[PDB]
Every structure is written in C-alpha cells, then in structure tokens.
Amino acid sequence: MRLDAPSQIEVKDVTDTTALITWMPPSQPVDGFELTYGIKDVPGDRTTIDLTEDENQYSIGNLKPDTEYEVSLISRRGDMSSNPAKETFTTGL
Numbered sequence: 001m002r003l004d005a006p007s008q009i010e011v012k013d014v015t016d017t018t019a020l021i022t023w024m025p026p027s028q029p030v031d032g033f034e035l036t037y038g039i040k041d042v043p044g045d046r047t048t049i050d051l052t053e054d055e056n057q058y059s060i061g062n063l064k065p066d067t068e069y070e071v072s073l074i075s076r077r078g079d080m081s082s083n084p085a086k087e088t089f090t091t092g093l
Contacts, residue, residue, distance in 0.1 A: 011089040
C-alpha cells in the first residue's frame with residue numbers, strides 16, 4: 001500500500017504571529033499527519049504537531065513577526081512515514 005505525502009500545501013491568513021496551514025491528504029488511508037514548523041534559518045527551532053487523519057489544516061500561533069518560516073508535512077501510518085511535503089512563508093509586520 002502506498003504512503004504518499006500530502007499535496008497542495010498552502011499557507012493562508014498570515015498575520016504577524018499566526019498562519020493557517022492547509023493541505024490535501026494522500027489518496028490512501030493514513031493514521032494521521034505530522035506538521036513541523038519553525039524559523040527556516042534556525043534548524044534548532046522546530047516544533048512538530050500531531051494531527052489525526054481527518055485534519056487537513058492547522059493554525060499555528062505565537063510566530064515571530066516579519067520572519068521566514070518553513071512548514072513540513074508528513075503522512076503517518078503505523079510507525080511509517082511518507083516523505084515530507086514542504087512550503088515556506090513569511091509572517092507580516
């Protein structure tokens with residue numbers, strides 16, 4: 001059974017400290033997703049959020065204003081993970 005990564009990762013409603021991350025789930029069943037986000041140029045700043053399979057969006061808060069972030073999404077299925085799907089965005093003043 002394949003385990004594709006989500007697709008069409010979009011970043012919406014970007015404010016100075018928040019942003020809505022959306023995505024299209026894979027075409028196979030999964031147990032959920034794992035969304036990692038943090039300041040792009042700061043490898044040490046990475047937070048990973050656990051999502052159920054019926055969740056296709058997540059609103060991230062407490063972000064740094066005017067800063068470039070990178071989001072990464074992985075599909076999950078029993079100890080197994082898909083490759084990550086990524087997107088970059090910059091918060092607004």
